[PDB]
Amino acid sequence: NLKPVDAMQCFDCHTQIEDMHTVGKHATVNCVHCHDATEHVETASSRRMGERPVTRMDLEACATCHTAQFNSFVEVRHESHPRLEKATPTSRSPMFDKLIAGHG
Amino acid sequence: NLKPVDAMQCFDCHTQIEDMHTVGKHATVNCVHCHDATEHVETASSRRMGERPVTRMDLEACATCHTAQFNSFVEVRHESHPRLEKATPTSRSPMFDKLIAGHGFAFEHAEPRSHAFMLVDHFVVDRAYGGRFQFKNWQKVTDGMGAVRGAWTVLTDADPESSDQRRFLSQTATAANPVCLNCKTQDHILDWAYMGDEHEAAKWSRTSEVVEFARDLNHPLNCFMCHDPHSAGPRVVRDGLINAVVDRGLGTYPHDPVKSEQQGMTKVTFQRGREDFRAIGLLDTADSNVMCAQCHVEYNCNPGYQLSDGSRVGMDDRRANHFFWANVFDYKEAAQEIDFFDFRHATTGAALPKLQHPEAETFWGSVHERNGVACADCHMPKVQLENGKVYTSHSQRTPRDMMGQACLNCHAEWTEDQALYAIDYIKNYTHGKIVKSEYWLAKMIDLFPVAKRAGVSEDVLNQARELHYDAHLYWEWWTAENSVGFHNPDQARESLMTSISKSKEAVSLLNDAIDAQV
Amino acid sequence: NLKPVDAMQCFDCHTQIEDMHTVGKHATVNCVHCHDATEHVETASSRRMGERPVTRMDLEACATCHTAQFNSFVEVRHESHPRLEKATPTSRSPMFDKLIAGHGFAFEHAEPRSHAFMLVDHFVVDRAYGGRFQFKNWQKVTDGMGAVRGAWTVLTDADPESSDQRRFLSQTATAANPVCLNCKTQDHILDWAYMGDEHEAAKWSRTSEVVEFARDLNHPLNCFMCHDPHSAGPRVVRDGLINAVVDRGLGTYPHDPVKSEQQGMTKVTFQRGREDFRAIGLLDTADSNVMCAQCHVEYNCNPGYQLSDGSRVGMDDRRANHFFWANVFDYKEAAQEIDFFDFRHATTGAALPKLQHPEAETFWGSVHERNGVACADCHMPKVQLENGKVYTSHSQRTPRDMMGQACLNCHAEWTEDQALYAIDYIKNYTHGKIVKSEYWLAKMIDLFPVAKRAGVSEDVLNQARELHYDAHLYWEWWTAENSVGFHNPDQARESLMTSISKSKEAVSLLNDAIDAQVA
Amino acid sequence: DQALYAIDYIKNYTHGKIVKSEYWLAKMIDLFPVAKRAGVSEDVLNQARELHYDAHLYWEWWTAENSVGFHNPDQARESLMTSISKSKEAVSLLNDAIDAQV
Ligand code: HEC
Ligand code: HEC
Ligand code: HEC
Ligand code: HEC
Ligand code: HEC
Ligand code: HEC
Ligand code: HEC
Ligand code: HEC
Ligand code: HEC
Ligand code: HEC
Ligand code: HEC
Ligand code: HEC
Ligand code: HEC
Ligand code: HEC
Ligand SMILES: [Ca+2]
Ligand SMILES: [Ca+2]
Ligand SMILES: [Ca+2]
Ligand SMILES: [Ca+2]
Ligand SMILES: [Ca+2]
Ligand SMILES: [Ca+2]
Ligand code: NA
């Protein structure tokens, strides 16, 4: 289970983040949802990063509080034909090979 | 009403039949269901046939006891578009006419449709009999049951008084020969010696007048092509397949000697006048891969030419009835092995192979084949019933129509739409490479006239012709093969990339040579 | 794998079978498909059976060569609501409990469902075996193929160590007897003498312990009930039907002697030793009206009482296995002919008949019957295939599921919705009259205790009881009959109006009598 | 479905012949610049132009006509086969003439 960190400790060094986080609609969302910064906090200075914190870039970081948007995003439209070459008579550019010759 | 005959009387002379019939699941099925042998019994000796018994080859001989399988077989899949030419921008081979120029398939090559129509479609296609045979009218194209009852119930002959192959319509060809019929019907099973060799007991052979032969034939894909009528056990009857698997020792799975042994074939020969006449291949298991490989293979069923010297190889030659039994990457070697090619390209002059529907050879080594999956699992699955006796569907068709049974019972992780999407990914990707291969082939082909007219040397032209053979092979395999890559996606990809590579090489060769003449 | 036997050797002693088998469409079907006679052939003479050969009665004996018919037969129509009690406001007979009080059907009477279930449903219904037999669990109710494979593959017996009929659950009855089984199975066809009379060669009879009999039976509606296994020709095997049509001379169409002659039945008897034992009725034509009338008729299959003196008529009596073979307006006379009634009404004390599903006798005289239409035309039509060999559907069900082939091929002037609307007009009208008949019957019934307690005379009560017999008959025929009038709408209408008329007469009689005693 | 299938049989077959007719027309058309530039005679070019009229007519009737052969399948077939025949004749004429100039 996630344990919240003291964001005020972060904000001592991260004024830009403070200015954004405390005003917006994620003011109640703790940093631990996306960052593991324990060793970073131990080693950073006001101007040097020290140990780099872990930052989650995965979309499931948002999906625990926004499952509807996540699930809508990840839906696969099976009707969007996959791996369908455009340089074919039934697709977008029947004469693409002749016209694009020289390009990757 | 049928009256049974005393089979014991038959068995006195027919020991092979006795051995098969008394042991299998047709031990109780009386001969009269399929044979009228009264005058035969009166006149035969132990070694001479006497009067020939009547043998039913119609599929309704099986339908009285196996109506479910019959009715499933004869169903017409209306969604399988009929008489749809492949050489069109919306079909399999948009540039087919340019690429196949010089071959008879330029006259017409339609997509396949339901099995009921195979014999009539063979008779009426523009490339086969010069337009001699036609449906009685355009309504009859729908009549699958009629075609099954007999081709001549639904077709006409433009000139019953002549038996020569000739053109009745201007843009037709006369490519049909007797070998073709072996993959359309086995009505001739007792009238055709093994391989279509000349034989005193055979009415028909490779060298017969095909129009006369045609007139003797009625039924498509007889039920007994896969099931021995005497034992009811699984078999093949197609000579070319038996020849590859057994005579040439290649095995049922040439890439896998273990599977070949487990799922093998035993050649059984029947004689006339104590001379070998015809043969069947009894299967160890009910292996649809091998059953379907009676027809869904690359073959010779046609005259051609020798690679070595260009001399004609006629219908009289054994090579005119040949199963290569080789995958795409072994094919060129297999064609060299018999010293054969099909046609010379009309524009390039290259000796080329003509490929035909190599589903069986393509399926080899695929993930599904390696996992023990077989054609029937996807194309003629068991029927699932809430309450009922299970039987095997005999409507051989795309799994799209029965995805639950064909795919999803195995692929429990997928919905139908997901499985379809996976098929389409492969087919879409493969088709794109087919199209690109055709683009490059066409680019090469179009350089030949320019090169010849610019005075490029025969040596360079011949180098380009050698590249054309490979560029053609590694492309046409895939327009011929019906799965658009699904049966072996990695192989299709590697092949088509090879085709493109070969064409590009030839294009560079010819352009450079033209530019040097200028 | 089956190995054929030498049928000619069998025929040296079985000339009767030879004469059927060699001429029909099963001449090539070897005996081994249905008989295991090896030890029999080793021990028999033409005059001594020796070891009894085994005869297969399972439907899969036919399914090997006739899978399409078998599979169509065993299909379960899920839309045919299962275990749906008729005595509810949303079913056939909203006031059934009041009206049938004193009869075992009060314990449970569900609507029919698909044929596959007939034997199991007979075994498990609350009125039949005191709740002795149950599905193994509630999942098994779906398993039509399992029921066809055999009842005892899907059912349990509460006490395999006893064979008496008794109540295992409190609100059950033990109405089952061996006659019932004749309309559920013919597994016992070689073990039951004609009519279930006592016979030295019969293992089972009308007087058998039905629980013991039940345990020996497995398959529903055997294929050979309509098709002779030797000739493959059309027949019936049901004794009661052969008895009405042939023995009693009533014919296959009692109201039409011409049609009776054209579409008749020939009784064929089989002996055990020198004595007649069992019989079948070979049909002149493949007449589904008569095939289906093996079961879809009004019958006695039960003990009862005599109208004359009230004495008990037990299962030992021939009357306990009886096809009345009479339309609704001839029934009372037919019951008088055999001096029989079923039960005394619990409230009114009236001697009453119990009616059961008289589809065959109702269909007679209807516009469709007079036009040569038969049950199969609407309920098991030929399959229509774009490409294929035609066969006859054996899924006997409402035409609503196959209106193109059941109705509209004949009624080219109608759309499906129009044909359905015509069905519904008749059913809605008929049901309204059933409901009104029940209202008036209930009104009469409720007056009986009031009249009795007011001191109304027995003479007046007996007059009202005589009216009750008729009010009941002319109502119950139609809750019993499954078409809700469609099979004969004019007859239903006339009958139900008669019921109401009779009840109204009884209500007036009793009310006036009560009022006079007062108050 | 059967009736639709019968329509599609005709339309599919006719369309294939339309496509083939166009293939052959295009092959002929593309030879004209090559022939003119190789110095093929006006007499040969005019012979080919006469064949073009017929090749065109017996093709274009069917792209113009909206039933894709259904209205008269035998006529479409005969016409389109004639178109192809005419184009093939012209192709042979022009190729031979070009090859003779070279
Ligand atoms: C729960 C601990 C959350 C996490 C993890 C994420 N978000 Fe969030 N988000 C949360 C709340 C309580 C709210 C406010 C809801 C309200 O309407 O009051 C939000 C809001 C958003 C919004 C809307 C902002 C706006 O309209 O100004 C967005 C676009 C949003 N959240 C996105 C988002 C992303 C992309 C996340 C992963 C990086 C994410 N949220 C995580 C709660 C939580
Ligand atoms: C009835 C008189 C039959 C005729 C005509 C045909 N078959 Fe048959 N077949 C019949 C029976 C009684 C059985 C055995 C059923 C069982 O499962 O016990 C069979 C079996 C088959 C099989 C299955 C064989 C096996 O699994 O080993 C096949 C493949 C088969 N029959 C095919 C078949 C063919 C192709 C027929 C026409 C040539 C044919 N049968 C006729 C009964 C009858
Ligand atoms: C030779 C006698 C064949 C055998 C054995 C098998 N097939 Fe076949 N198949 C054959 C032909 C000549 C055709 C074309 C028929 C026509 O009139 O065009 C086909 C077609 C198919 C198809 C396409 C069906 C469709 O709906 O379009 C499929 C899916 C197919 N074949 C599969 C298949 C299977 C799985 C086989 C083994 C059970 C099999 N065929 C055998 C010729 C022959
Ligand atoms: C078995 C090795 C075959 C030989 C010999 C011949 N054909 Fe065939 N044919 C075969 C199959 C498996 C299929 C279906 C798959 C496919 O890709 O088409 C076909 C199909 C046809 C068709 C219909 C499709 C078409 O090309 O228009 C026709 C008209 C046809 N075959 C004709 C034909 C001719 C003329 C043959 C001898 C020259 C011939 N076939 C042989 C299998 C086999
Ligand atoms: C090869 C292309 C076949 C043709 C031609 C026919 N059948 Fe077939 N049949 C085939 C397979 C692959 C199977 C399943 C084998 C397995 O065990 O998986 C079958 C099966 C049968 C059976 C057995 C019962 C069943 O499984 O349905 C029967 C009775 C049968 N086939 C009959 C039959 C008929 C009547 C045919 C002509 C209409 C027919 N088969 C052709 C393959 C092939
Ligand atoms: C499942 C794992 C399959 C196996 C085993 C076999 N085939 Fe197949 N085939 C499969 C698919 C997904 C497709 C594409 C179908 C689609 O609708 O996109 C095919 C296609 C064919 C066809 C053409 C069918 C048509 O387009 O109507 C044929 C003739 C065919 N396959 C034959 C065939 C043979 C003979 C097989 C055993 C050697 C075989 N297939 C196996 C899936 C599967
Ligand atoms: C004479 C030597 C017999 C031969 C040979 C066969 N059967 Fe028989 N069978 C015979 C007798 C005397 C009887 C009893 C008749 C009587 O008076 O009751 C029978 C009976 C049968 C039955 C019915 C058994 C029953 O359940 O009541 C059957 C199904 C039967 N026999 C079958 C049969 C078969 C299939 C034979 C050839 C393999 C056969 N019998 C030979 C006398 C003789
Ligand atoms: C295969 C060994 C069979 C067995 C087992 C059963 N039947 Fe049969 N039946 C079989 C054949 C070959 C035929 C003739 C088919 C034809 O049209 O040529 C039949 C026919 C019937 C019929 C139709 C009879 C008629 O129209 O006169 C029926 C009603 C029938 N069979 C029923 C039936 C029953 C009920 C079976 C189990 C007791 C049975 N058959 C088994 C082949 C075989
Ligand atoms: C006695 C052996 C019967 C014969 C012969 C026929 N039917 Fe029947 N039918 C019978 C029973 C015991 C039942 C009820 C089964 C149950 O388990 O509840 C039925 C039911 C029907 C139905 C209703 C089916 C439904 O979907 O609800 C119909 C339509 C029906 N029966 C028709 C019918 C026909 C037309 C017959 C002659 C071909 C026929 N039955 C014969 C008992 C018996
Ligand atoms: C797994 C989590 C289940 C869910 C979801 C459903 N059922 Fe079930 N059911 C389950 C088990 C393990 C069993 C017992 C199996 C056994 O043979 O021991 C059952 C049983 C039933 C029954 C029979 C009940 C009885 O008293 O005999 C019925 C009628 C049944 N299940 C139906 C059913 C329905 C309709 C469900 C969806 C609402 C359902 N079950 C869900 C396991 C699970
Ligand atoms: C033939 C003349 C029959 C006799 C004897 C018995 N039943 Fe029956 N039963 C028969 C038919 C045609 C039907 C279906 C039509 C209908 O109206 O139900 C039935 C149905 C049943 C059912 C299911 C419906 C129900 O009432 O719950 C059961 C449980 C049933 N039959 C039992 C049963 C008993 C106990 C019998 C002897 C007292 C009996 N049936 C005899 C036809 C015939
Ligand atoms: C009476 C209630 C039937 C029972 C029980 C079975 N069948 Fe039947 N069958 C019945 C009818 C009214 C008909 C049509 C007769 C007509 O000529 O109109 C049939 C027909 C058949 C046939 C013949 C082929 C066909 O028309 O489909 C067969 C082979 C057949 N029936 C088989 C069969 C089987 C296997 C049964 C048990 C599952 C069975 N029938 C029962 C009436 C009745
Ligand atoms: C068409 C002209 C019919 C004839 C001939 C027979 N029946 Fe019928 N039946 C018919 C209809 C329109 C209905 C009502 C069905 C509905 O869904 O509303 C019925 C009903 C039955 C039932 C009950 C079916 C059910 O409710 O599931 C049975 C058991 C039944 N019919 C039996 C039966 C018999 C035995 C027939 C010949 C004597 C008969 N029907 C003929 C239409 C027609
Ligand atoms: C009656 C007013 C018709 C209309 C509407 C349609 N068709 Fe027709 N068609 C009709 C006749 C009398 C015939 C000739 C019958 C004969 O055998 O002599 C036909 C023929 C066809 C054909 C065959 C064409 C040919 O051989 O050249 C086809 C393919 C056909 N009909 C199809 C068809 C379609 C699809 C229709 C709806 C658009 C249609 N027809 C209407 C009579 C009538
Ligand atoms: Ca197809
Ligand atoms: Ca080839
Ligand atoms: Ca160009
Ligand atoms: Ca019902
Ligand atoms: Ca009764
Ligand atoms: Ca009250
Ligand atoms: Na068997």
UniProtKB/Swiss-Prot annotation, chain A:
Cellular localization per UniProt: Periplasm
Sites where the protein binds heme 3: 26, 62, 65-66
Family: Belongs to the cytochrome c-552 family.
First-to-last residue of the parent protein present: 33 to 136 of 553
Post-translational modification as stated in the protein's UniProt record: Besides, it may lower the pKa of the Tyr hydroxyl group.
Chain positions recorded as heme 2 binding sites: 31, 34-35
Protein purpose: Catalyzes the reduction of nitrite to ammonia, consuming six electrons in the process. Has very low activity toward hydroxylamine. Has even lower activity toward sulfite. Sulfite reductase activity is maximal at neutral pH.
Quaternary structure annotation from Swiss-Prot or TrEMBL: Homohexamer. Dimer of trimers.
Record-listed heme 1 binding positions: 10, 13-14, 40
Native source organism of the sequence: Thioalkalivibrio nitratireducens (strain DSM 14787 / UNIQEM 213 / ALEN2)
Protein name per its UniProtKB record: Cytochrome c-552
